[PDB]
Amino acid sequence: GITAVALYDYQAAGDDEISFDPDDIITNIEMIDDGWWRGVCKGRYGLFPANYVELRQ
């Protein structure tokens, strides 16, 4: 599976996107859009602002 980590604290603009703390790491992060991502944060899926998040490996 995939897993990302927020480089900084960001707040999702729309309901389609979720927010997550920097140190707060999450899993199942799959890239749907070349500019946007998606993953499960604390048991919830959503969109990941590529500007404030990064997929680990």
Binding site: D33, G35, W36, P49, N51
Partner: peptide
Amino acid sequence: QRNRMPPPRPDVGSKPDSI
């Protein structure tokens, strides 16, 4: 269409456009 670019990245050395 689901095309949308992420917001700008925060910077400390950034300066305003209006002086």
